[PDB]
Each structure stands twice: as C-alpha cells, then as structure tokens.
Design an enzyme around this catalytic site. Structure first.
Site, PDB file in Angstrom:
ATOM      1  N   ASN A 375     -51.505 -19.783  42.017  1.00 20.33           N
ATOM      2  CA  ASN A 375     -50.670 -20.927  42.337  1.00 20.33           C
ATOM      3  C   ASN A 375     -51.214 -22.182  41.660  1.00 20.33           C
ATOM      4  OD1 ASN A 375     -52.933 -20.921  44.190  1.00 20.33           O
ATOM      5  ND2 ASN A 375     -51.851 -22.512  45.336  1.00 20.33           N
ATOM      6  N   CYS A 377     -52.976 -24.448  42.941  1.00 17.51           N
ATOM      7  CA  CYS A 377     -54.327 -24.733  43.404  1.00 17.51           C
ATOM      8  C   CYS A 377     -55.296 -23.588  43.145  1.00 17.51           C
ATOM      9  CB  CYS A 377     -54.311 -25.076  44.896  1.00 17.51           C
ATOM     10  SG  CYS A 377     -53.321 -26.530  45.316  1.00 17.51           S
ATOM     11  N   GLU A 379     -55.807 -20.616  44.496  1.00 15.58           N
ATOM     12  CA  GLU A 379     -56.382 -19.814  45.565  1.00 15.58           C
ATOM     13  C   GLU A 379     -55.415 -18.802  46.167  1.00 15.58           C
ATOM     14  OE1 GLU A 379     -53.976 -21.704  48.611  1.00 15.58           O
ATOM     15  OE2 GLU A 379     -54.757 -22.357  46.669  1.00 15.58           O
TER      16      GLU A 379
END
Ligand SMILES: Nc1ncnc2c1ncn2[C@@H]1O[C@H](COP(=O)(O)OP(=O)(O)OP(=O)(O)O)[C@@H](O)[C@H]1O
Ligand SMILES: Cc1cn([C@H]2C[C@H](O)[C@@H](COP(=O)(O)OP(=O)(O)OP(=O)(O)O)O2)c(=O)[nH]c1=O
Ligand SMILES: Cc1cn([C@H]2C[C@H](O)[C@@H](COP(=O)(O)OP(=O)(O)OP(=O)(O)O)O2)c(=O)[nH]c1=O
Ligand SMILES: [Mg+2]
Ligand SMILES: [Mg+2]
Ligand SMILES: [Mn+2]
Ligand SMILES: [Mn+2]
Ligand SMILES: [Mn+2]
Ligand SMILES: [Mn+2]
Lengths: 683, 287, 287, 683
Positions: A375, A377, A379
């Site tokens: 994604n 981010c 994670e």
C-alpha cells in the site's frame, strides 16, 4: 505570541545546563486555561449538547439511537471519570487542532477529548453499553488508539470513510485502466490512500490488437493516475496520495524508476504518485551472482502461458521465460538496478521496496493469492485478485481489492496496565466493527474483498518510548527480546479473538479452509518454539501478565482448527503519523527521529520533546540517524515474525552514507526476513 | 599568487536575481514619498548604466589585454556578472516596483543627465584608449575601472543600504548587497593588476602615474558631488552621501596601493547597519 | 524575438567542474588499449585547443561587434562558460588520466598536427578579419563560429560519447556531455544572430553569402575527413565517425537557416546512447 | 530522388515565365509506372485476390458473403471499366500512402483505387449488386467521397470505426467526469475525435457536498481529459485529439481560455486539447452596449432553479440570474473578453467560436434539446442530452451523445455530371448504411443517440475549385448565387431522400413529431422564397438540371408531413482535408490557401498546384489570405442557410491584421448568421 507558546518555547532555554522539560506541563496548562476552556461551546448538560450536535448535522443519529440516553450519559461519565490530562502541549494542541469537533465556521470547539472518546466508544459498541464503557476505558487509558480516519470520523455525519488504506489490482486493458482511474479518484475523494499494482500492464512497446509498438507502458498509466490523484485532492488540504507498485522483472522497471528522478523530463515526471518495487528472491539471487538478468514483456508471457507474469512464481518461471523464444525480454544488470534503486532512494526516498519472497514464505493465504504489492504506507500485505472490467452492458468480473482499517496499541500504556490480552481483544472487536460498517459504493472489488476477507490491521506504537522509559537501548538485545515476547503475545491474543469471533458468528473468512491457519502450518513455530523473554530484565516487565507457552499455542491451534478464523489478516504496523502526538507516544515501532521535535505552526514555533524525555533517560532516547540500521533491521525482523502483514519500515540514513551502505541495508533486511522497506530518510 | 583564490571566490559567489523574490518590498515601496521613489529609481538607473558599460566594454577589454588564461577567466567571469547578472537585477527591481511608463522615463533620464553622461564618457574613453602591448594605457584604464568599482557605484549604493538598514525594501536591498559584495572583490582584483604595472615603472614614471590617478579621482569626485546633490537634495541626504563617497574613494586608492586622500568622517550608522555512489561487491550479499 | 529566452536557457544550464568527481574513471581507463588511450588523448587535446580559441577570441570578438545590451550579456555569459568552466573541465580530465609529462607531449603533438592546425587557423582567420561596422565580415565570422560549435567539435565528441554509451569513462563522459550541451545552444544562438544579418541583405548578396557558407563548409569537411582517418583508423571507427560529422554539419547549416547539404544517415547506436491588440470602438458591432 | 518527384519539382521551374503545369501529368505517370505498378501485388484473377484478402485477415468476409462472386466481379469490372486516371501526382501519392491497402509489412500494395472503390461500394450496397454498381459509378466518377474513416476502413477486418466525430455531454459529478474520461479514451482508441461539453461542470471555488471552495473547476477536468487523450493517442499512429467547449457565461471562461496562452504555466496549460467557446446572443449584446457583464457559477444556478445554466435560455434568464441573490456570479468586461478571444485566436487560432443563438434560431430539433457545443471540427450542431452515470451497481441514466458519419459531394464533378439529385440520394443512402452498421459498445449515449436520431453529415468540397475552373470569383455575388442554388438543391434532395427512407422503413427519428420538419416551420423560407440563380451565367451552369421551385418545396413539405423524416440531421460541411487530394478538389467550401502547395515528404519536396490551376484561371484561384474575410463570411452564410448542421469555417488572417479586425470579422459572422468559426489562420 500566545502564553502557552511562550512557555513551550522555554523548553529549549537551558537552565542549569539542562532543558526545562517541566515547562511543557505549564505550557499545556496555560494553553488549556487560556484557549480551550474559553473557545469551548458551552452546553448546560449532556442532553442539550447531544441534541444540538445531532440537530446541526454533526453527529449521526443512527449510532446514538441504539442507546437509551441513560446509557450514553453513563458512558460519557465513564470517559470523564478518569480526569484525563494531556501531559504535554503538543498532544492537546494536535487533538484540538485536528480531531476535536469544531463548528462549521471552525471558530469554536464542540468536542473535548472525553467527548470524542465517548462518541467513538458508542460507535464501536453498536448498542452495547458495557462494551461502550470498556471501549471508553481502553481509549481514555490510551491503551488503544483508533486510526486517524476512524478516530476523527466515527459518529460524524460529515465523516468520510473510516478505512483509509486501499490497494487496487489493475488488469491489462483500457477498460480496466479507466476503471482503475475512476476507483482511485473515488477512493481519494473519500480521503483514503490508494495503492495500485501496475505489474499486469504490458510494457512500453507492446502490441495492441496485433499492432506492434503501440502500448505506452506503465508510465502513461502512471501519468493518468498522477493526474487523477492531483484532481481528487480532497479539498486540497491534504493532496491526493497514490502509490504505484511494479515488479522488478517488469520491462518498464527502468522507466518506472525514472519517473522519480529529479533530472527526469516534466512530461515523464510523476509528482503526486509514490512508487514501490516488488523484488522476488530471484532478482536478489541474480544480483548476488552478478549474473545478467532479463526484464520481460508481460503480455508476451500472458499470451504464452495464459497467466500474468506477476501471477506466476518467478523463482520457478524465470528460466522458462528466458529459454522461451515466444517470451520477449531485454537484458539488464541486476547489480546496476540495485545501485539505481539505492541512488533513487537516497535522492528522493523512493521507491518502496517489497521483498516478495519474504512476504509470501510466511503468507497464510497463498491459496487465495500471493502478495504482489503493498500500500501507500508499505505495511499492508494481503492476497489480491485482479478484476475484469469489461465493456459497458457487459458483466464485470469483480475480484478482490485489499483494504484494512487501522488501530494501534500503545505499548507503554498496555504494559503499564498489564492488559495486552484485553486491549488486543477490544481493539480486534473495534476493528471488526469498523470493517463490518464499511461499504464502498464505487469500488466493487474493495467492497467484495472487505466482505469476504474481513481483513483488519492492528498496529502498535510507543515501542521506542516504552523502551527508553525503561532503561533499554533500542538496538540492544533486550529490546528485541521484549519486542519478540510482546508481539508474540499480541499475535496470540489477536488469533484467539479472531477464532472466538468466528465461533460466535459461525463464519470464517472466505477461503479460510485452504489457509495455513486451517491446516495448522501457521502454528508450527509457536508450538515448537518458546517466545518467553530470555532476559530477567525483560521477563520482569511482563510480570503480572501470562505469557503464552507452547502448550497455550497448541490449545489455540486446536481451537482455530475447531472454529476457524474470522479475519484473513489481523496485524499490520502502520506509521501512525499524527495520532501519536495525542497519545504522547513515539511513532509506530520505529526509533525516534529527534529527541526534541521543533516545528513551526502559524508564525510561532513549537518544541515537542519525546514523551517521557528527561535527563535520566536522555541517552536511551537515541535518535534513529545515530542508530545502527542493522540493529533496527534486527528489531523489525524480530517484530515481523509475529505480524502477519507488513511493517512500515523507514530507513534513517546519514548524509555520509554512500549508495553501497543503503544497498547493504536493503540486502540485510531481505536476508533477515524484512518484507517491505518504506522510506530512505537522510539526516 | 592570487588569481586562483579570486577565481574560486568569484565562482562561489555566483548568483541570479531570480533567487530573491521581490514582491515582499511592494508595501514598503508604496509607502515612500514621491521624492524618495524618484531618487531611488534614478540611483538604480545610474548604477545600471555603470554596470552596462563595465560588462559590455570595461571588463572584456581589460580581459583582452591581460596575459594568462586564468587571469582572463577571472576577468571574463567578472564581465559576465556585470551585464548578465548585475545590470539585469536592476530591471527585476524596476519591473516589480514601477509601472512601465516610470521605467521608460528613468531610462530616458539617464540618456540626458549630464553628470551620468560625463562619468560614462570619461571612464569608457579610458577603456577605449588602451593600446595593445602598451602597459601604461592599460594601467590608466585599470585605475578608471577601480574608480568605477570602488568609488563611483557608491553614490548609488548609499540609498538601498540606507533603506535596508531601517528594515525597508529589504529584498531589493538583498540584491544590492550581493552586487556590492561582488564589486568589492572586483575592485581589489583589478587594483592588484594595476599595482603590477605600476611596480614595473621608474620612480619618475610612478610619480606621473600617481598624478594621473589623483587628477582623475578629483575630476570624477567633483562631477560626483554635483550628481549627488542633484539626486539627494530632494530627500535631504546630500551631505551624508558625500561623506560616504569620500570614504569609498579612500578604499579605491587603497585598492591601487595609494594612501587615503580624504579625512575620516562619521558615516550614517543606518548605512553601516545596511552592510555518493559506490558499487556493490560480492561480499555485500553475505552476512 | 529570442535573446531573453536564450538568456534563460543559458543561465539555467550553469555548472562547475567540481560537481563531477573524476577519479573513478581510472577504473575503466586502465583497461583500454594503447591505441584507445592515444586516440582519446589526441581527441581531448583537439577539443581543448579549439575551445580555447573560442573563449579567447571567438565569443569575445562577436560580443564586441554585435549591437544590443541583452545580446552582449548572453554572449558574455557564453564566453565565461568557455574560459571559466569548459577550459577548467578539459584540464581536470587530462590531469586525472595522464601524468604531467604525457599531457605536455600530447599537446606538443596536437599543436604540430596538420589537420588540427588547418581547421583551427581557418576559423581564427575569419575572426581576425571582422571589421568595425561591417556586418558582412561579422556574418562570415558567425558562420565560422557556428561551424566550430555545431560541427567541428563533433569529430572529437564522438569518442567520449562512444565510451560513455558503453559504460566506460563515465565521469569524464558526463563532463563532455555537459560541455556539448553548452556548445549546441551556443551554435543555435550565434546562428540566429547570423540569420538576422543574412536577412538584411539583397538577393544577390544572400546568394553570395550562401556560396561563402557552402564553400567554407566544403573546405572544413574535406579536412575533417582527413583528421578523422588520422585519429580513428587505429581504433577502426572512421566510417561511423564520418556519418556523425555529416549529421552535425547538417545541424550547423540548419542553425544558419540553410538547407541540409548531406543525405540523412543513421548514427552509431552506442554514440546515440551516449548522446497587434487594438480595442473595439463601438462601431464594430454595427453593419 | 525519385524520377516522378523530379518531374513534379519541374512544376515550379518557370518556362517562358509560366509554370510547367503539364509536368504533373508526367510526374503522376512516372510515379505509377515506376513505383505503383512495381509494388502492386499480382493476382491471377479477382477470385484469387479476394480469397487472399479474406483469408489473410485483410477483409471482413461477412460483407463479401452477401454477393455471389459473379456480382462481385461485375462490380469490380464496373469500377475498372472507367479507366480512371489520377490527374496529378499528389492525388495518387495521397491515395497510395494513406488509403490504399498495403501488406502487413507496409511493403506491397494490395489495393488500387478501383479495388478500394469496389470494396466500399459492395460494403455500402449491403448485398445489392445494382446498388453496388451505382455506388461504384458515384465514387469512380468522384461525385461523392466517403469520409476518411469510411473510405479507409470499409470492408476491412482490422479497421477502426467508420464514424470519427463524437460529442460528449459531461454531467457535474465525479462519476460523470470519470465516465467522460473513459468514453473519450474509448473513442480515441477508435480513431475518432471527441468533443466534450464542460458547461455543466461547476466553476472553480464551488462547494462539493456543502463544503465550499472544494471544486477545481473546468481546468482540472481539462487536464484530466488532455492526459487521457495523450494516453489514448491511437497507438501512436495519430495523437489523440479532443475538444472542450465552455459557455462564455461560465465562470471558468477566463481560466478556460488561459489554458491556451503560450505564457500559461505548464500546470494549467493544456497541450493536445482544442477549446471552443459557445457565445449566446446575450454576450454579444452586452459587449455591444459595453455594459458590465456577469459570469455565473453553474452549481449555484442548478441549486436555485434545478436546471443547468446551459440548459436554460440565457437571453431570458441572464437578468434573473443577475438579480437572484442565491446565484453566484462574477463581474466581467464583455468587450475585454471579446478582445481576449481575438488575441488568443491570433496567437494560437483558439478558441473555436460557436454562436449559440445563430445555431438554435434555425435548429430543427430544439424540442429534443438546444445545441450547446460543437465537435472537434466545429461543423456538428445537433441536440444532445446529458447522461447521468451513477455509482457502481446503480442504473445509469443514459442520455444522447452526438456522432455523425461524413461524406462529401464533389461539387465540380456533381455539376459536370448534372447529378445533384442522384449523387445526394446515393450519398444519403451510404451514410445511412454507415450509421446503421455502427455500434460503439463503450459509449452508451453515443450508441443510443446513433440508434435514435440517425444523424448523418453530407458535406461538399471543391466549391472554390469549381468556381475558379468556371471563371467565377469566390468573393463575387455570382459565386454566392451559385452556392445558394446548389446547396438549396442539395438540401431539397437530402430532405426528399430522408423522407423516402422514412416511408420505406416506416420509421422516423426519435422525437420527429416535435421537430420543425413535422410542424412544417422548417420549409417556411423554401415555400415563400425562390433560390434559382439570379445571374444568367450561374443559371446556365445548372442547364440540364431541374432546380426545385416553391411548388417543389411545398410538395416536399407535404410529403414530409405525410411520411416524416428518417434523419434528425443530414448536412454538415466538415473540413475534409486528407481526401481532397485524392478527389483532386479544393478542401471543403473554403477558398484555397495557396495556388501551389509545397509539401515535404521525407527529404523530397513535392509541389501541388491547385486542382485545375492554369494560366487562364490563375486570377480566379485567388488565395484565401488575400480575400476579404467579409466576403468569405457572406459566402459561408449563403451556404449555411441550407445546411441544418454547421460549416467548418476557417478565418484566414494576414499578419498585419490587428485583434480589432478579427473581432470585426467575428461580429460580422455573428450578424450574418454564421454558426461556428473553426480556426484563425494567420499568414
Ligand atoms: N493538561 C490538561 N489536559 C487536559 N485538560 C486540562 C489540562 N489542564 C487543564 N485542563 C482542563 O482545564 C480545567 C481547569 O484546569 P485546572 O488545572 O485549573 O483545574 P483545577 O481547578 O485545579 O482542577 P482539576 O484539575 O480537577 O480540573 C481542568 O478541569 C480540565 O478540564
Ligand atoms: C487502447 C490503448 C491501450 N493501451 C494499452 C493499455 C492496456 O494495458 C493494453 C491493452 O489494451 P486493451 O484495452 O486490452 O486492447 P485490446 O484488448 O482490444 O487489445 P489486446 O487484446 O491485444 O490487448 O494496451 C495503450 O497504451 N494505449 C491505448 O490507446
Ligand atoms: C470529488 C471531487 C469533485 N470535484 C468536482 C467535480 C464535480 O463536477 C463536482 C461535484 O462532485 P460530485 O461527484 O457530484 O460530488 P457529490 O455529488 O457527492 O457532491 P454534491 O452533492 O455537491 O454534488 O465537484 C472536484 O473538483 N474535485 C473532487 O475531488
Ligand atoms: Mg485486452
Ligand atoms: Mg453531484
Ligand atoms: Mn557590477
Ligand atoms: Mn564590478
Ligand atoms: Mn566550450
Ligand atoms: Mn561554445
């Protein structure tokens, strides 16, 4: 210059050779007494305030109507019974400038911290007054922090989506590309970050309808996505954020990386789109042996084998692709590509690195699909199935698009209260409620995957803060021992709660039977290895808490086999950017970047010391840039062995570190089991 | 013994006016009296003229006659700064603060102003009198150039510095300080080249060269007094500026290796306040 | 119509030798054969010698005779790049790759070389023949300048680009690419100044200037072929270098507003990899 | 250099002070004998050629299966019996480089002019051998030229759509904008030009869901569309071309116009998107009186009245909008906006000008809708209805988009053969067949409107050529008299053919009963006025041809009232650029730009004299830049009074002309009933 700002700025004014850390309590007290108490809308009683908020289109009446007003009053009294006080100016400032409900003119404060917590607890409980009181205690104790979307929007009529992380698979067709652009704009409109997998798109110079050299590659689609994310800027306060992921064995990989070069031409530059690269073990093996590698044209592979290149095992299919004349490939230097990646990450911090084999060797849902990308981010690591968006009037083949709603345990507060199990289970219940209450009307695959997978992300924060406030070095073996034990316990109790939810509701997640949870292969290491602390100092921190043993894990394995698991994914450690200030906790499980955080808000600058920072623990609050990134990798790998999803892992690099140092850090992370690398931050 | 360090200093000082955003001066400019704005425009226009000729003529011609590729590189760089950076910066200031008609009028005003024409005539005349392989004509032009760099600019520099020192027109003032920083090193460098030529002469010849330098300075000085009064009487500052130009005349003489000519005076304190990639080896893949 | 645009492009391309670290070239230099090292040295010295003429004479002489303050500023900037940036860059490359004694010998050889001298003196001859207030002689010199910037350098640039496209001598190849990028814009700019003069001429005078340009091109081209064989036969590249010369000759002609002289050819892929408002008056609405 | 090219270049070599025009016939003969015959594939018979073309995926076998091979042979013999010879080198060069079918490697020629004509005729006849022979005679005589898409793609398996002009209405919503982007990409993928109406989008700074200042305006959608067109650039063979239209009263008009300023920032600048402006008579009236004008925010008007601003009558609703406090508006200077339009057209040729009230005062289908915008060529003027695209899993409200398939009458050839009626009727039949066989499965509004309205565009070309070859000045009153008579006859016979088709099929176009044809108001000027030539010289040109009288028009009116009309729109004069060389005709009805056209093809420069150019007609071949644009406006207005759609009207300006002259030309065109102005070309 306001009085509270003056008091806060006194932090850096050293007195007797030491920082005046006590000025922050005075700063927050003055801030409250002179701004917040004055600018807080006054209501005679809770009934009048709630009626005003509901009438004026502030609070949704659907969730409030499930409780008798006596129950709501009791929950609100429970929230206020703690007499919660913000310990530093920055926490209260962040809350009352970002999350506190303000009138439509943004001049008055309608919500206190207790009011927001009570509203969130009532939203979570879904009519359960005792459950709502438990949620109020959990959040007021600051053991669990709902993610910024859930925390800010819960119970609000104007609220956006409580989920903010979206992953979309893009199929290799104009219809699918248009649908991807539309869905990205729709999800950005909701304020959620959108990550797209571009590995299925054919490379530049591929044929469209037996017309050669017609395809524009992934960079044209990236330009389209960048423009779409720029247009859906979410009022412009927070610019539209999107990430594109490409497999390293894709032909367009070099052009994909060139979009982030500063020297890149403006017609190729993609300003608003983050880029991540998916690196299978095969590429690392090729670079290690200095062997010449090949990047393949995805459509030739798809035509030859009827399956996408990123849907196949590269460690098994690379030699077949190379030896297959019908597959088109061009030669590359894997070590040159790694050096280019390191240089690009040093210059701009991009791309994100996903180690596909590290992710998929422990993935529990490989039967559903392998994890092909991450994604925005870095994670979120879940199985995805691409959708087949056909022509108008033709039925679409809706696949599975990844999404998860986030929550963070406060490690310091969870350990102080000795409530790992209860906090984890309550957080799992709240995340499940948020997942069940989400319905995306313009992302068919996102909505279908939310219904089928029931994926949640339960992160953690304040690892470094907790360790420093306990006389433990972040890089020390004791820190890794504590992280191992704590996150093993978190995984155990989240699995237990997922199994209990599956038993109570009578349903598991879709395709659970083929998962490693069902076959028991997931619990092999937990039933064979003991994860109790190996240091007396660490073992003492867990005193008063039951640490699961191999027998407990065997019992949990049997229980899961009996009842299944409600969530396909449970744990992911997101960055937790701005909500950490409210919790007065360090960000995620990363080490702190600075001991004292200097920031300018408006025309006045503010100083934020790390929570619990003092002379005694000053040396334990070592900054990340001063840390050995190998020890940070070791700690993250220790944590990652108990997280089923990924961990947002930022690399903190000194300006003197060469590209070889970054390459070695990435190689050590891949060697140690690290799934993803988020950012290369340079001091 | 010095060219290399001047080369390094000049290239490390490289700048462009576009680096400085000028819209911040809009209000302090609007607030000045008509007399103040008039003097300011005219002052910068006089500076523009000097830099135009220093860039077009003075620095290139001296570069042509000075021997040595490194000395020529420094002089060529200084020439570029004069017309490609300094002269142009004034137009950036004008285009921000003033309407086109006022800009047109001030450039017409430089053409017809007798003191500005006289000083240009005198300085450029000496540049164009340089004869190949004739070190004396070259010395005379270098004296003229030092007087332009270290003396003549200063009747102009006074006013932006005077405002900068009061916290007014500070973005324009930042540009002017960068220009001044450049001219200071340009005046020193050309001064050192002039001293080289002077030091080759007999005592009798040296005595004549000092006479030339002092006569030229006095002639330029007397003209600059009239120019200063013409510009500054309407803002009440002529006497103050005169003290400043005398101060800088002494600096010009010193750049030429001569003793100060004017007595020391107290300058307005406001004006004083105005002043890596490495490859991956095989062992990098094992731990 | 064009000087401010070229000003912008020139100043935004500003760079310094120190920005590129050169020492890592020794890791590929050591693996070249004697003929490759010899050709590279000779080519490099050729470029250095020609570029020095452009810095000391070519650009400053054109800046002197061209009218217009803004044009003089752009031309000054270009002269600065030759003397302050390019010349130091060539010296840096040499000092990195060869010991002092080897550099002195290569320059002695190239200084005596018949084909390098022929072209260097042909160009310099036209610069020396410019007469004050004679636009015909200025045009002829501009043609010579464009031929140097856009054509004569390229028999030399070929080799560093050839290595650069193969992953060899990457640091010096990056430097050469920056230099070449400057010479390209220099050639285009001087070309536009030449076309301005050309367009002011009668039809008979135009035909005469075209004949001059083609005749000059022919002389230089025939010498380039000899220069090319002299340097590149020992490394087997002359055929491909000749294609590159003709391709760049055509670019030089197009810079001067003339038609291409040579048929279109493909270039070596390794070298390619290296490379009037008026207002309505209330009656316009009625008919 | 090719021998034929050397012969052609001898055109410019003056001999006896005269151009060697006869050298072009030698040039074309040499071109054929030395290149075309050599590179033409050899087939023993027509049966073998047809088999090879069908099997090798060159031709669509379905349309050829409707004829016995005897009929196909007869049609091909009919095409070949004419012994057609190209009169100039450029005609044959253009045909054999653009439209002649070539092998997959583009090395050999598989089709001659006769082969392409026969294939097109067989495709048109749809199984009728006599009709196919009639089409072959029409095309080989060059009386009718099907549009480039139809001519190139008819009967080909690997072909784009035969319709190449589409108009899309965009509704004010994210779903509608995303669908518009998708449809534009789908249509450009087919090779057609796409025009989008952006007048219903709210202006910059409007509220999105009761949050103010959230809208990016039409410029953000313009950037989205520009990137979408750049991406779907027809596999690189032809850059994607799109047009955006904005009503002058839209608030974003100044930002919309600024996207075409050269000094415009790259962020706002749109590079590949053409822009047109829709100017109601209200704006011209305001500018004429120098009164301060207002530009309105469309969403405020929609909320206040429930209708879109461009769906309402501006001439009536302008004062109400100005007096309504709930309608947001911005004061503007109408004359300053007019001068800005003139300067922008002088600098770049944009925007296109659509005079809305000129279009709609004669519009026959105002009951269906007013005409709100034009196409990418500014000659399509049809009623459109905006579609409402809703969220996924909801039902979309499909409206009416615009698309017409084009064909051009060769005026010189039609007049020489005295076959206005037959040519017009055959062209109408072929255009009806093309419309019937067209089905776009990714543009629901386009497909629905094609099925419902049955719109066709029958254009004309060689007006200046025909006039010059007959000793008539383009600007003379005699030329306007001829244009009046000829286009009156064309309109009469197209209406008669439409009525005959409606009677044969027993079906009219959707909502015909409300049209001016049904009520008879369309025929008022034809039944009350005579359009026979007023000059004896022009009247002689029509000798042997029946010129419809008032009695004929009354009979046609009665026939239409009895049987109705099959086509909502029939006539539109498109620019018709590429196929003018093949037809050896002047482009469209515009005057010639240059007597001899100098083109560069590779490194060889080709010389193209205006068709029929000679010493005796040199003066009549006056260049457009030397003509009085007022006389050109008079000619176009004379023609436009018989065209139901628009005429693609290019303005040819000298560099000495100021913006005032351009504004005067625009105002005279608006006064003279001009509907659209295509381009401002400067010399
Ligand atoms: N640091 C803080 N964090 C949160 N709320 C605060 C903080 N400081 C003050 N407040 C709010 O402001 C009110 C007034 O603060 P103050 O310290 O003056 O209270 P008090 O009268 O001493 O007693 P108490 O602490 O019980 O409120 C507090 O009751 C609380 O509502
Ligand atoms: C239409 C189009 C597609 N593409 C790319 C995007 C898609 O990933 C890819 C496939 O396009 P598709 O839309 O799938 O085209 P197609 O399915 O009709 O042709 P084929 O079966 O041979 O694939 O081509 C372009 O780059 N430009 C274009 O204009
Ligand atoms: C979502 C979004 C819309 N818009 C513009 C484009 C649309 O024409 C316009 C309306 O968007 P809509 O998609 O119609 O949003 P909405 O229907 O939920 O809000 P409303 O009730 O006010 O209609 O807003 C943006 O400029 N940026 C954005 O991010
Ligand atoms: Mg496809
Ligand atoms: Mg809407
Ligand atoms: Mn200067
Ligand atoms: Mn100076
Ligand atoms: Mn140079
Ligand atoms: Mn140069």
């Amino acid at each position: 210059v306001p009085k509270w700002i003056q008091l806060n700025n006194e932090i850096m004014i050293q007195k007797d050779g030491k920082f005046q850390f006590d000025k922050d309590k005075e700063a927050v007290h003055s801030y409250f007494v002179d701004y917040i108490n004055q600018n807080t809308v006054f209501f005679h009683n809770l009934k009048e305030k709630l009626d005003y908020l509901v009438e004026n289109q502030y609070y949704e009446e659907e969730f409030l109507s499930l409780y008798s007003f006596e129950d709501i009053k009791e929950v609100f009294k429970t929230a206020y019974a703690k007499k919660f006080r913000f310990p530093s100016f920055m926490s209260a400032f962040k809350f009352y400038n970002d999350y506190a409900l303000k009138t439509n003119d943004k001049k008055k404060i309608l919500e206190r911290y207790e009011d927001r917590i009570s509203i969130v607890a009532l939203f979570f409980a879904n009519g359960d007054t005792e459950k709502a009181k438990e949620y109020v205690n959990l959040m007021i104790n600051q053991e669990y922090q709902p993610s910024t979307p859930t925390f800010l929007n819960a119970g609000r009529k104007r609220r956006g989506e409580l989920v903010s992380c979206f992953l979309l698979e893009v199929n290799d067709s104009l219809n699918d590309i248009s649908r991807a652009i539309d869905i990205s704009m729709q999800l950005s409109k909701l304020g959620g970050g959108v990550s797209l997998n571009l590995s299925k798109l054919r490379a530049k110079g591929e044929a469209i309808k037996d017309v050669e050299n017609a395809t524009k590659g992934v960079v044209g689609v990236m330009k389209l996505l960048d423009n779409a994310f720029r247009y859906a800027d979410q009022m412009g306060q927070r610019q539209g954020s999107g990430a594109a992921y490409l497999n390293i064995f894709h032909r367009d990989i070099n052009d994909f990386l060139d979009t982030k070069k500063i020297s890149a031409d403006e017609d190729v530059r993609v300003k608003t789109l983050s880029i991540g690269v998916v690196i299978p073990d095969k590429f690392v093996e090729l670079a290690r042996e200095d062997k010449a590698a090949y990047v393949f044209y995805p459509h030739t592979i798809y035509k030859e084998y009827g399956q996408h290149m990123d849907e196949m095992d590269m460690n098994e299919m690379y030699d077949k692709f190379v030896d297959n004349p019908r597959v088109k490939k061009e030669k590359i230097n894997p070590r040159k590509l790694l050096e280019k990646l390191a240089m690009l990450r040093s210059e701009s911090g991009y791309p994100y690195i996903m180690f596909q084999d590290n992710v998929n060797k422990v993935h529990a849902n490989n039967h559903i699909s392998k994890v092909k990308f991450s994604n925005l981010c870095s994670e979120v690591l879940q199985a995805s199935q691409v959708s087949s968006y056909t022509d108008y009037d033709e039925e679409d083949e809706i696949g599975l698009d990844i999404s998860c709603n986030l929550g963070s345990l406060n490690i310091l507060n969870v350990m102080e209260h000795k409530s790992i199990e209860k906090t984890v289970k309550l957080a799992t219940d709240s995340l499940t409620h948020v997942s069940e209450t989400t319905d995306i009307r313009n992302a068919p695959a996102v909505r279908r995957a939310n219904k089928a997978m029931k994926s949640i992300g339960l992160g953690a924060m304040n690892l470094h803060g907790y360790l420093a406030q306990n006389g433990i070095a972040y890089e020390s073996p004791e820190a890794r021992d504590f992280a191992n034990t704590f996150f093993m316990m978190v995984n155990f109790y989240s699995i237990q709660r997922s199994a209990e939810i599956a038993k109570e509701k009578g349903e598991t997640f879709d395709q659970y039977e083929g998962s490693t949870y069902a076959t028991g292969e997931y619990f092999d290491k937990y039933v064979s290895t003991d994860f109790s602390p190996k240091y007396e100092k660490i073992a003492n921190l867990f005193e008063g808490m039951h640490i699961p043993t191999t027998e407990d894990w065997k019992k949990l394995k049997a229980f899961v086999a009996e009842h299944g698991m409600y969530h396909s994914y449970r744990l992911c450690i997101a960055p937790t950017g701005s909500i950490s200030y409210v919790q007065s906790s360090t960000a995620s499980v990363m080490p702190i970047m600075e001991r004292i955080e200097e920031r300018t808000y408006g025309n006045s600058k503010t100083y934020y010391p790390m929570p619990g920072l003092a002379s005694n623990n000053w040396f334990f609050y070592k900054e990340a840039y001063d840390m050995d990134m190998f020890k940070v990798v070791d700690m993250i790998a220790t944590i990652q062995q108990h997280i089923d999803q990924g961990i947002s892992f930022t690399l903190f690099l000194k300006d003197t570190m060469t590209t070889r140092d970054l390459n070695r850090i990435d190689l050590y992370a891949h060697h140690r089991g690290i799934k993803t690398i988020y950012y290369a931050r340079t001091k | 013994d010095f060219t290399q360090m001047f080369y390094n200093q000049n290239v490390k000082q490289f700048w462009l006016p576009e680096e400085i955003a000028l819209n911040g001066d809009l209000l302090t400019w609007k607030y000045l009296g008509k007399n103040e704005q008039d003097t300011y425009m005219k002052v910068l226009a006089g500076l523009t003229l000097l830099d135009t000729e220093q860039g077009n003529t003075g620095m290139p011609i001296v570069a042509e006659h000075v021997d040595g590729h490194q000395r020529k590189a420094v002089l060529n760089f200084m020439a570029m700064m004069e017309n490609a950076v300094h002269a142009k910066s004034y137009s950036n200031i004008f285009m921000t603060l003033a309407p086109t008609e006022t800009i047109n009028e001030v450039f017409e005003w430089v053409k017809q102003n007798k003191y500005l024409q006289k000083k240009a005539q005198m300085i450029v005349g000496l540049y164009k009198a340089i004869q190949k392989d004739d070190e004396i004509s070259l010395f005379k032009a270098m004296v003229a150039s030092v007087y332009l760099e270290s003396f003549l600019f200063y009747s102009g520099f006074y006013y932006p510095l005077y405002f900068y020192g009061q916290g007014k027109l500070m973005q324009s003032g930042e540009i002017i300080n960068l220009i001044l920083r450049d001219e200071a090193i340009h005046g020193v460098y050309v001064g050192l080249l002039a001293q080289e030529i002077y030091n080759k002469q007999t005592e009798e010849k040296k005595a004549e060269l000092r006479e030339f330098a002092i006569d030229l300075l006095n002639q330029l000085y007397e003209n600059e007094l009239e120019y200063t009064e013409d510009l500054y009487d309407q803002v009440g500052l002529s006497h103050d500026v005169k003290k400043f130009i005398r101060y800088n005349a002494n600096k010009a003489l010193m750049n030429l290796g001569f003793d100060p000519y004017f007595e020391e005076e107290d300058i307005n304190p406001i004006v004083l306040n105005g002043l890596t990639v490495e490859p991956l080896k095989d062992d990098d893949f094992y731990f």
